[PDB]
Ligand binder design. Structure first.
Ligand SMILES: *[C@@H]1O[C@H](CO)[C@@H](O[C@@H]2O[C@H](CO)[C@@H](O[C@@H]3O[C@H](CO)[C@@H](O)[C@H](O)[C@@H]3O)[C@H](O)[C@H]2NC(C)=O)[C@H](O)[C@H]1NC(C)=O
Ligand SMILES: *[C@@H]1O[C@H](CO)[C@@H](O[C@@H]2O[C@H](CO)[C@@H](O[C@@H]3O[C@H](CO)[C@@H](O)[C@H](O)[C@@H]3O)[C@H](O)[C@H]2NC(C)=O)[C@H](O)[C@H]1NC(C)=O
Ligand SMILES: *[C@@H]1O[C@H](CO)[C@@H](O[C@@H]2O[C@H](CO)[C@@H](O)[C@H](O)[C@H]2NC(C)=O)[C@H](O)[C@H]1NC(C)=O
Ligand SMILES: *[C@@H]1O[C@H](CO)[C@@H](O[C@@H]2O[C@H](CO)[C@@H](O)[C@H](O)[C@H]2NC(C)=O)[C@H](O)[C@H]1NC(C)=O
Ligand SMILES: *[C@@H]1O[C@H](CO)[C@@H](O)[C@H](O)[C@H]1NC(C)=O
Ligand SMILES: *[C@@H]1O[C@H](CO)[C@@H](O)[C@H](O)[C@H]1NC(C)=O
Ligand SMILES: *[C@@H]1O[C@H](CO)[C@@H](O)[C@H](O)[C@H]1NC(C)=O
Ligand SMILES: *[C@@H]1O[C@H](CO)[C@@H](O)[C@H](O)[C@H]1NC(C)=O
Lengths: 294, 398, 165, 294, 165, 398
């Protein structure tokens, strides 16, 4: 009767400078047993007289890392344990994003690896406003799992998320010794950022030496829908000039009217929900065009 | 005897100019008995002027009356008196007669919503009435009446409502003019306040050059907050620092919201001042005031032709040499294309090595031999050197 | 003499001039013809025959009683008066602010001169409001006309005091 | 028994075009008597049969003016009467004035004499304010006689008048046939007008070529008293100039400061009660002075 | 479509912009950090998963109930609010004059579209005044923060109606 | 959890710049139990800036405090937060810290009574305080307190009482400055309002000549109504229509009330403009503004000397006669003494009858014989003729 293992069935873990308490796996509780370090014959001692069912180490230093053997005083090999040293987990770093009104996604990286089997528990809840306690769960606003599809990708997925509610995501890094939960407040309406438009093209307009026509499409991750349009902001700049000029086109087209005649112009655009929800997208790839002559 | 006996009727009438007015003075029985008089003894006075006896009309033994026709005085003060004991006038009663005209239906009524301020409406008042006339701006939806707007004494032809403007909803507005002599309402108008907005002019105007070419200046400014409700249109005007009149960019080129503009076709090294105004793309409303002026200077560029170039020659003080005075004229500003930094002179003797001299002046004294020389002059600015003026100066025996 | 006594006679002459000008302007604008009366004003039963003879408490006592009646009446005009007399402001209000002020100053005068103070008399009940605007105009003539006599004798009475104190 | 006479004991009066009724003085009432016109024997008749105690004339015309004789039918001379013709009195014209604070005085002239013994009744009363009736006379505010000292001078005198009260003077012209009472409202404070100052003198002021000193005294009818001072208004004018200049001197002296050098100046002054009571006096006699040279 | 439906969505977008600007300026001036709550605001239980599916009375009914609660709360801030928030006028009053106006217009909208009117619900009792000026500031954040969500879904709801009528 | 838990003390303090301020944040028991935190977990922020951890001081397990020294920011916004579940800040309470200085005692306090308007007082405010400061004008007699005068937001250094001025009675007046950080009163002053009157300037100014002499002009005007309370004094200034500066009559000559004034020693035919101001004879108060300007012209007078006079002579076209051209110069304005109406020339031959010719020009052509003539010239205006210039023109054989 000892703590069931963490990973493999006969290995236990500990942190340096702390206390670690090893048990002999295959020995009846109450039988006295002896402990040795691999390759070194000195009999180790312990606060419990010196012969119990469980070895204790107040040392926990690097010299204590290796393979251990336990045997009963009769000589019978009662089992083997491996001591791997490490450190408690650091707090993970979490960011989220969302390119549609249904799902959003968050990612995380360890701030420290420790050398320990650092697996992750991920969950999130919908905060309410009554606030009598943390228990208002008839629809069960508790912890909901973020399934990891090929059990990596380092990202939670939310299907069927509430667009306007605010969520507190609970990412907990865990190792065999504790937790350091990261909590991140996220509202879909504040965090949202669409991808940039694709296929930006600029064309001359015959007859007008200082107008250019820019066209582009929605991003593919954003389905065109009458409820959430997007506003756009277009920028243009003549070659060698340092400062961008900004316009806010209606729709998927924009006639630029102050282009310098006969000069290449760079153009880039970004997108945001038309009701100023979330934040502006990253800038599009630069596109170049040249006004017609005459 | 005590307390004002009898009365004048009507109490305090107001009548229209050129109309008729009849006034009746009636004496109380107690006064009539005491003084032993009657209606025939009543005399009427106005503003210290005696009414001629021929104008009285005794309606009954208790009351006398007078009738004024084609009334032309604005404030007849009427008093009724008795001649009592004889050769003595005593005051019975009195009234003030005010006259004028009824208010005309207000016309050319117009309103304006200055961004950040509440709606203000203006209207044309008609003929002067000489009476205290109240003006109340009325506004109501088919299902709701809004708070009345009372014009100020100082500004009787304008009123400013006390409720904040609500765009995108049609509001029915009209003004009601009323005074003691009459009530009338102007015609009703219907409009969406969004089409009567007068935004403020753009501010934070800055003029910035571009070190590429010399015929482009970039304008930047901060649009007015009102851009959240309407799409702005602009008018950009420009002229040279010395020009007397303004030119204007084609409206079609500045027909939609923007926060910057690149002006092209500008003259080299000329200082320009800019000013802008904006309004809703559709033209419905009144134009805002002009923005603050902004100044800027174009980038450097080089002379477009070589300068005129000539010389004068005199004998030198050194035997065998000639003193040649090269002289030239400062390029015209439109040809100089900028601040003159310095000049470069070159001198090449036939089949010999070139000599060059940098000169910061319009004359240079050099000692030359008696051989033939080729002289050239270029002027240099930040961008480069002009083409050279070349002359053959023949030998002295030519 | 004394500076306090000099000052009160000077202010009465100032108020007298103000009252005469407003009374003449008012009759100029609203020419009432005939002698107008009100039951509440006092009869100014003084022949100026002999006025030195009278002693100090009586001269001051009579002025206080008369001026208090006139003050109520001036106040009465402002509160319940007809719109016809709005043209007499702000001139009527400055007189109110000045006559009330002088009456108060006289009570201070009485204390400094150690004169016997009269017993608190029972104030007269309120005057009914005028029955018409012109009744109010006639009332205005009585107060200003009646006042420019009380003040004339006030200048005179204070001057009698001045020859002694 | 006939109306007792007016003036002399046996003469009666009448107006033309009216009716006049003569009586025989010395005849017992009830005795028939005859009437004749002097020098003309025709027996006159009358509505009362033709023989009563009293002659009546509906005629009343100018031919009826003369001496009449009445006699009883026996021949006894019953007396003589003289018919003098006239007209009712006209309304007299009344003005008042006052040069002191005690007394004032009024005068009157007939607007018509009529040819009749036009004597005058004069009186005045003090108007009150209670106004229950014309009867509030415990101090007896009724009619008070204006005694005529040598029984002429055409003026009432008021001794011991109330300075501030208002008076209605009642002058009644009377002849044997009626009255035409003149009523004149008078307040001593409004009507008062002092006499002009006397002895106005102007003197040069050595050292100052454009100053003159004017001096004068009170009028003798005005006793100097601290209760009622007088204000003064001085006027000066250079010879040949048309417009007067006015100053308001304090006291009995005034230094003029804008006199034209070397020119005669006319000066006149008038007086009024210092509290603007009553009205300004008439102008003083003109006085001339000349500024010193230099 | 219809002009009346176009106009209401446009005004909500105008009011939404006004609410966002005042909410960002207010937190800029009074940096509250942390999620603030009030028991009286409604829970906006809508996932935007499927919103076309919902029928016409419910979309309009929910907006009316939420907006009426927000209107009372805006009015509550003006009357019993602490002096600390006087800096939010006149911007706060224009929003009051605009949100109240739009709520009223919606009732007119309901009549013209012949939608069933909800039964007169029992109004919620009065909110106690804030215990302090800073409690009032936290309350201001909740109303403007809570409003700029109701209005966002109002634009959305009206746009759903627009695709049909 | 619900409602703001705990509190900040003091509620809303105001402190003086460079002073010390200690702030205490205390957590309610319910919040402390729920989050499993205490004072050591409290973090303080101001205007979005994190207060350095080294500045906190835990006073008890329930409350944390910070102490600011030499406070230099005008509007510290203070907020108290808990780090709850860890790495999450939630708002507990908040307060606004305002700072400044107490008001200084107002100095150089002065009042003025413009005739027809109520008393107005002015005072010097001291250092800027950056806080809303109220100013109240206080006035009271030893036996009575007058209505307070509240300064206007726009004009915090001036107030205008609501009661009409009462001359000849001493009134005690002073201003009281008070704000959230302190109360102080200015020194008390005592004066009779009659000595602080600012009358209006004279109006209805008219300039009238006198057809006697040419060096006198009579000034007339209407004095201001304020003459009923104080005796007026005046200042009369005058200059020529072309002069650049004003001259002034000796104050002593205009030291008492008057409604007219005769100006002497004026230059002939010169146009003069006048302006006047007035005040109480004793000089106690402030001078009124200048009256309206008035213009006038002096009367006619005659030339003071004969003009310069000469001639030119040439042969005539008529045998036996000589053409003599007499010429003269227009008198200088100061010598002309007015508008030239015309000229008179006389010619007298030795022992013959005088001939006279009126000429309206500066030249005359006459045909004279060969004898000697005496020629004279006078100029005439409305007043008379000048003395003559006389010359002998000798015979041609002289
Ligand atoms: C975020 O999530 C983590 C884990 O998903 C939460 O940590 C868990 O918190 C509970 C209570 O605070 C710990 O107690 C456990 O309770 C259960 C039920 O009574 C009991 O059977 C266990 O023996 C244990 O006592 C639990 O150890 C802890 N860790 C886990 C579950 O791995 C954390 O509370 C969440 N943070 C939030 C919601 O803010
Ligand atoms: C101004 O004075 C005259 C005379 O002094 C007044 O005239 C008199 O007025 C009375 C009444 O109006 C007349 O009636 C007389 O009354 C007495 C007393 O009852 C009676 O005995 C007489 O037989 C007669 O009826 C009177 O004839 C008349 N004339 C006189 C007295 O000569 C006049 O009333 C005064 N006006 C005023 C005070 O306004
Ligand atoms: C004499 O005639 C006049 C006519 O004006 C009468 O005055 C009117 O009398 C009626 C009677 O009911 C009143 O209703 C009117 O109001 C009176 N006129 C005015 C202007 O008020 C007068 O009553 C007549 N005399 C008598 C004794 O009846
Ligand atoms: C811990 O110490 C703090 C010191 O600030 C205590 O707070 C004060 O407690 C007293 C107790 O009567 C109150 O009167 C004061 O008003 C408190 N301070 C403030 C700023 O309000 C606190 O009470 C102590 N803890 C306990 C449990 O008593
Ligand atoms: C009354 O008015 C009429 C016109 O309507 C005019 O002819 C007449 O002269 C006026 N006066 C009268 C009728 O006394
Ligand atoms: C005009 O307005 C004034 C002030 O509100 C009011 O006293 C007057 O009665 C009004 N006039 C009318 C005819 O209603
Ligand atoms: C408090 O004020 C004193 C001066 O009175 C100053 O020396 C000190 O630094 C301030 N701060 C403290 C004591 O924390
Ligand atoms: C200053 O005046 C305002 C307005 O009357 C008032 O609200 C404020 O409380 C006053 N300040 C003080 C410190 O009394």
């Amino acid at each position: 009767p000892c703590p069931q293992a963490w990973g493999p069935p006969g290995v236990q873990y500990g942190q340096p400078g702390r206390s670690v308490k090893l048990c002999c796996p295959g020995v009846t509780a109450g039988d006295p047993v002896s402990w040795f370090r691999d390759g070194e014959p000195k009999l180790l001692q312990g606060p419990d007289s010196g012969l119990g069912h469980e070895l204790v180490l107040a040392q926990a230093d690097s010299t204590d890392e290796g393979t251990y053997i336990c045997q009963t005083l009769d000589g019978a090999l009662g089992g083997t344990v491996t001591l791997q040293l490490g450190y408690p987990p650091a707090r993970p770093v979490v960011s989220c994003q969302a390119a549609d009104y249904e799902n959003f996604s968050c990612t995380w990286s360890p701030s420290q690896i420790s050398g320990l089997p650092t697996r992750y528990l991920t969950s999130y809840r919908k905060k309410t406003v009554l606030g009598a306690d943390s228990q208002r769960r008839s629809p069960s606003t508790g912890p909901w799992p973020c399934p990891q599809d090929p059990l990596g990708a380092a990202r939670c997925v939310v299907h069927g998320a509430e667009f306007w509610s605010q969520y507190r995501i609970n990412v907990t890094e865990v190792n065999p010794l504790g937790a350091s939960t990261r909590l991140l407040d996220v509202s879909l309406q504040s965090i949202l950022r669409p991808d940039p438009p694709q296929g930006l093209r600029v064309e001359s307009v015959p007859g007008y030496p200082r107008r250019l026509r820019a066209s582009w499409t929605y991003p593919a991750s954003w389905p065109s829908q009458p409820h959430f349009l997007l506003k756009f902001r277009l920028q243009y700049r003549p070659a060698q000039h340092p400062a961008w000029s900004t316009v806010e086109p209606a729709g998927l087209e924009e006639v630029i009217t102050d282009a310098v005649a006969g000069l290449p112009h760079a153009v880039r655009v970004s997108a945001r929900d038309f009701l100023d929800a979330g934040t502006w997208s990253t800038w599009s790839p630069e596109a170049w065009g040249t006004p017609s002559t005459g | 005897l005590l307390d004002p006996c009898g009365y004048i009727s009507p109490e305090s009438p107001v009548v229209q100019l050129h109309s008729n007015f009849t006034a009746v003075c009636v004496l109380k029985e107690k006064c009539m008995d005491y003084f032993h008089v009657n209606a025939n003894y009543i005399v009427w006075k106005t503003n210290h002027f005696t009414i001629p006896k021929e104008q009285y009309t005794i309606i009954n033994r208790t009351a006398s009356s007078v009738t004024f026709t084609d009334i032309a005085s604005l404030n007849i003060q009427l008093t009724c008196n008795i001649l009592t004991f004889g050769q003595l006038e005593q005051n019975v009663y009195g009234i003030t007669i005010i006259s004028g005209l009824p208010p005309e239906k207000p016309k050319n009524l117009s309103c304006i919503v200055n961004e950040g301020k509440k709606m203000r409406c203006e209207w044309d008042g008609g003929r002067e009435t000489h009476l205290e006339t109240n003006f109340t701006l009325k506004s109501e939806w088919a299902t709701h009446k809004f708070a009345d707007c009372k014009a100020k004494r100082d500004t009787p032809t304008s009123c400013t409502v006390d409720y904040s403007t609500v765009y995108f909803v049609n509001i029915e507005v009209w003004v009601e003019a009323e005074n003691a002599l009459g009530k009338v309402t102007s015609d009703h108008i219907n409009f969406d306040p969004v089409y009567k907005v007068k935004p403020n002019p753009p501010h934070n105007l800055s003029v910035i050059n571009s070190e590429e070419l010399s015929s482009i200046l970039k304008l930047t400014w901060t649009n007015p907050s009102i851009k959240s409700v309407i799409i702005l249109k602009y008018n950009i005007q420009y002229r040279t620092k010395d020009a007397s009149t303004w030119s204007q960019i084609p409206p079609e080129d500045t027909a939609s919201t923007r926060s910057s503009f690149t002006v092209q076709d500008l003259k080299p090294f000329t200082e320009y001042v800019f000013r802008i105004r904006c309004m809703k793309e559709d033209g419905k409303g009144y134009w805002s005031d002009w923005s603050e002026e902004a100044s800027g200077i174009t980038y450097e560029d080089r002379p477009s032709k070589a300068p005129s170039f000539w010389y004068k020659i005199d004998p030198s003080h050194t035997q065998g040499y000639r003193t040649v005075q090269l002289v030239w004229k400062t390029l015209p500003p439109f040809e100089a294309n900028g601040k003159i930094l310095d000049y470069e002179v070159t001198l090449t003797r036939w089949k010999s090595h070139l000599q060059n001299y940098t000169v910061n002046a319009t004359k240079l004294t050099v000692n030359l031999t008696n051989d033939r020389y080729l002289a050239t002059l270029t002027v240099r600015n930040l961008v480069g050197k002009s083409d050279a003026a070349v002359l053959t100066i023949p030998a002295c025996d030519f | 003499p004394r500076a306090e006594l000099d000052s009160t006679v000077l202010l009465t002459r100032s108020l007298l001039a103000d009252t005469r000008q407003l009374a003449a302007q008012l009759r100029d604008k609203f020419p009432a013809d005939g002698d107008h009366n009100l039951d509440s004003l006092p009869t100014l039963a003084m022949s100026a025959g002999a006025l030195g003879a009278l002693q100090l408490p009586g001269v001051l006592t009579r002025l206080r009683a008369d001026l208090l009646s006139y003050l109520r009446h001036v106040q009465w005009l402002r509160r319940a008066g007809g719109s016809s007399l709005k043209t007499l402001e702000p001139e009527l209000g400055t007189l109110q602010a000045r006559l009330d002020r002088l009456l108060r100053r006289l009570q201070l005068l009485m204390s400094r001169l150690a004169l016997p103070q009269p017993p608190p008399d029972p104030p007269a009940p309120p005057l009914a409001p005028p029955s018409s605007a012109w009744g109010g105009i006639r009332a205005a003539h009585a107060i200003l006309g009646g006042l420019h006599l009380t003040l004339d004798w006030a200048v005179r009475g204070l001057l009698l005091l001045k020859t002694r104190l």
